[PDB]
Amino acid sequence: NATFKNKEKPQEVRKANIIAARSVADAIRTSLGPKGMDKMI
Amino acid sequence: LAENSGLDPIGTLSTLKSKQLKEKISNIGVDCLGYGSNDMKELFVVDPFIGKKQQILLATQLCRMILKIDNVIISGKD
Amino acid sequence: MIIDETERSLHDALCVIRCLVKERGLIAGGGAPEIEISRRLSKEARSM
């Protein structure tokens, strides 16, 4: 099918926000549970 | 098929599945050609059973063939 | 160390008791409610 051309792409903002949030979530995920891995900051 | 026919694929697939699951078991497909309603059983859009079986078998075999190959080696050119 | 650990443990216990007070009752841990809810929602969504 076809969609709007969208010369300006607000969806890029949403993509960037989702990428950043998912990266943070993945970083925090590995610490879940008593066996979670320690993080160094 | 819904996407190619100009229909909303997300809505079309869900409607077909709901009609074939909750209401009753029938033959409801994508109205690719000009039709007054769904339920191809009344539209008499019929295809051979063995043809569909062969298509499914070929697709499964091709998927297995591509999946069961792990390394590709291509020789150089002189 | 004794007093620090006691303070932390009592804080955790107070948080648990507060969770009980706001909504009485406990649920099984280990992700069991997540799996059960996922299965039930997957079964129900077929009617949508």
UniProtKB/Swiss-Prot annotation, chain B:
It comes from the Eukaryota. Disulfide bonds: none annotated. Signal peptide: none annotated. It is found in: Cytoplasm. Belongs to the TCP-1 chaperonin family. Heterooligomeric complex of about 850 to 900 kDa that forms two stacked rings, 12 to 16 nm in diameter. Molecular chaperone; assists the folding of proteins upon ATP hydrolysis. Known to play a role, in vitro, in the folding of actin and tubulin. In yeast may play a role in mitotic spindle formation. This is T-complex protein 1 subunit epsilon. The gene is CCT5.
From Swiss-Prot, chain C:
It is found in: Cytoplasm. Heterooligomeric complex of about 850 to 900 kDa that forms two stacked rings, 12 to 16 nm in diameter. Molecular chaperone; assists the folding of proteins upon ATP hydrolysis. Known to play a role, in vitro, in the folding of actin and tubulin. In yeast may play a role in mitotic spindle formation. Belongs to the TCP-1 chaperonin family. Present with 5530 molecules/cell in log phase SD medium. This is T-complex protein 1 subunit delta. It comes from Saccharomyces cerevisiae (strain ATCC 204508 / S288c) (Baker's yeast). The chain holds residues 385 to 432 of 528 of the full protein.
